[PDB]
Amino acid sequence: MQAIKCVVVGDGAVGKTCLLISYTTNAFPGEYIPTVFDNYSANVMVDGKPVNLGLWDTAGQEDYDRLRPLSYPQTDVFLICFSLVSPASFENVRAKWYPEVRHHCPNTPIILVGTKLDLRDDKDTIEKLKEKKLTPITYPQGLAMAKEIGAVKYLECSALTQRGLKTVFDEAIRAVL
Amino acid sequence: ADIVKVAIEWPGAYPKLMEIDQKKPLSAIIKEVCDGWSLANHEYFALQHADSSNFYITEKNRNEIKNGTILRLTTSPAQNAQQLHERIQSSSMDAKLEALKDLASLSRDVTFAQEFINLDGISLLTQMVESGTELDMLSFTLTAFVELMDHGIVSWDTFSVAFIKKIASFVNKSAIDISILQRSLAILESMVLNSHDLYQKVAQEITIGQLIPHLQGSDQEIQTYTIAVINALFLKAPDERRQEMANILAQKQLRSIILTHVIRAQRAINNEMAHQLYVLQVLTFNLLEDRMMTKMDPQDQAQRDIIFELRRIAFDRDYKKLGFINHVNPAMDFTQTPPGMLALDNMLYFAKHHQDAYIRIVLENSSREDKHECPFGRSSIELTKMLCEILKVGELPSETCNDFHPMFFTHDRSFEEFFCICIQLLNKTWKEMRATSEDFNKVMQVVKEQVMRALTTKPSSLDQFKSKLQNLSYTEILKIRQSERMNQEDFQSRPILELKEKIQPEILELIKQQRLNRLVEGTCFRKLNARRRQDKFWYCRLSPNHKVLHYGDLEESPQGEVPHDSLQDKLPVADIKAVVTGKDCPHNKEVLELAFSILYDSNCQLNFIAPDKHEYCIWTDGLNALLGKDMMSDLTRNDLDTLLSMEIKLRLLDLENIQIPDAPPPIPKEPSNYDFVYDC
């Protein structure tokens, strides 16, 4: 059940809160009760890594560039979040949490994810990804990006679907591997 | 309502454009035209064609008038007949020549020829031929004559004996002007056809040695009309004198003459000469019908002596070793007609002219006391009967047939020669059959199926006929014909093709259950860039539920399969968007034909390289199944056809030897009474 120091970095437009809150309440594709104080957590008897994760959520907001820096020095891995309906995510990636990785540790598993994967490509997300005239980023832009600064996997997950979820949680666990 | 647009012309005037109403009489039309042309006496005029041979128009022929035709008003048919009767007898030779030409031109019309025969112009032409001196004029004369008489308004018996002797002199003298001979032969043929007394008068005025040399001419029309006169004298001849006429013709080598100068001549045989050889053939075969229907008198000692001599030539029971059903009185076996006396004529010919074959076939079955002997007598009886049947001995000639057997023209007795040939082939087939006396009739059918399949090849002579018989087998060529008459009628017959489509989809689904099994099993594949111990081969499998996949990996192996599970195992199946092929895989040209990618949730896909075109059919078709699509490969269609072959096979096991109605029979009216007397 071995728990882990899981500090989930990730930018404010991402929303991993609902994400965790819809997986692990273990209810449906969709409806889960979201939460406020959000060090989250989850698990499985996962892989003989029969383990629990303690998701260390600081504020996802920027007033923590110490308090979040007070969440780094020894976190096993880091959940490092971006999204797809807004390329600023596909950029902050080598740009913000990645330095912040460079910044606290050059040793641990460090990875990436574009949220809004399920949202990248609506005619309306297509639509106001063209109105802003940037890209419903190609995951290919990913496979470069993640060849680039250090996403040891690279993933996506959505709690509306409650999906990509374990997928995400996959090596978010087996980083041990 | 019934209108035809026509232009009417006149020498020296402009054409009048008339919308002729077909209900108005012709006289009113001609009157309108003459009034438009200021011509008095409209009743002196009629209407004719300005085009080709310009038949005069009557209330009957005016219906054949098409729109836009050019027509010429002219003298009435009566006026034309009058001016022609005047001018064809003119003392001016040029006027008489032009008159005879125009008359031979216009005599093909029945409406003018009516007026011309009604004035005894037939007698004018008759006198012109009978007493004309230094006789072009005669050619048009006789052409007009035949065109006039071809319309049946007066009888041919009106011709005087002087004209008959004159045309018989023209056909009977040394070769004269070609056209005169053609017209004289035509007149002779027609007068023989229409009158018996005229045939009597003609037969005494012409000889065989006169009708024969006209076949020596290089003009094929001379030949056609000559053999036409021949067949006319033959059809009109008495039955008793017909055989004598045939003997007189054969004595002058008529058969070999036609062989050397017609069927082997330089000029190809036309339709009419084929008809004439056909009628000569059917009559020469008819010459045997009299002996076909005459029964033997078993009390006639000479007729029994013929049987005794035919036995003596062979043997040197009392008749059981010769093959007659009646062992003590074989004459009874001849009282049935057909064939009766023809059988005896044929077998006596086979003994006198083909003694070797006769003694062979009789001594090969005269000492056989097993049930395998071939009775020669009964076989010859039934064989003359069946050859009279297949040839249709005793049939009258008709106008619709042009066929002949050229073989008969190579031998004077080719009938009895062919008899000997077919009895030889009969005993040959009998020995090949291992047949018995009980299987007699069957054997005959085979021999029939033999002979009827040889004459269709049109053998030029009797030896080619024998070679064809040597080629025929039992019932091997008939078995090939039976197997071929089904492959064509399977698809080219709507009554057979109709069930080819009702079950056809269910036949494909019958295949598709096998394809679903082939989907559940799962086969090997090929990974791209799978070098350096990466698993090139990799097998597959799928759950029974058709909603989750299960596949693994393999290696290059000398022995075979190693079903080791991979992490790439469960891909639920209801998610498969579509399966693409060829270039649409996102990543040696032959593997690209074997390359095909499963396409599902937008960017999650998998590429494949099937182990063969077999599995390339299997996988893509089972994936069309997992999404319900029709099968795309032509090997699946080959399985479809291999199935529907047996599936219509089971059905033809119900409709054998029954004519397949390609035009569907109609549904009759319903039974108004629904009171079933027998219950359900």
Residue numbers in the entry:
A (entry chain C): 1 to 177
B (entry chain B): 5 to 139, 153 to 333, 354 to 624, 634 to 726
Task: Provide excerpts from the study.
Purified DOCK2−ELMO1 forms a stable complex with nucleotide-free RAC1, which was further stabilized by crosslinking to avoid disassociation during cryo-EM grid preparation. We then analysed the structure of the DOCK2−ELMO1−RAC1 complex by single particle cryo-EM. Refinement of the combined particles resulted in an EM density map with an overall resolution of 4.1 Å. The ternary DOCK2−ELMO1−RAC1 dimeric complex adopts an elongated “S”-like shape with pseudo twofold symmetry, measuring 320 Å and 65 Å in the longest and shortest dimensions, respectively. Located at the centre of DOCK2−ELMO1−RAC1 is DOCK2DHR2, dimerized through its A lobe, and associated with nucleotide-free RAC1 through its B and C lobes. In the ternary DOCK2−ELMO1−RAC1 complex (open-conformation), ELMO1 adopts an elongated, gently curved shape. Superimposing the crystal structure of the ELMO2RBD−RHOG complex onto ELMO1RBD of the DOCK2−ELMO1 complexes showed that for DOCK2−ELMO1−RAC1, with ELMO1NTD in the open-conformation, the RHOG-binding site on ELMO1RBD is readily accessible for RHOG engagement.
The evolutionary distinct and smaller family of DOCK proteins activates CDC42 and RAC to control cell migration, morphogenesis and phagocytosis, and have been implicated as important components of tumour cell movement and invasion. The binary DOCK2−ELMO1 complex adopts a closed, auto-inhibited conformation, whereas in the DOCK2−ELMO1−RAC1 ternary complex, DOCK2−ELMO1 adopts an open, active conformation through a conformational change of the ELMO1 subunit. Our study suggests a model for how upstream regulators control DOCK2 activation through a conformational change of ELMO1, thereby relieving autoinhibition.
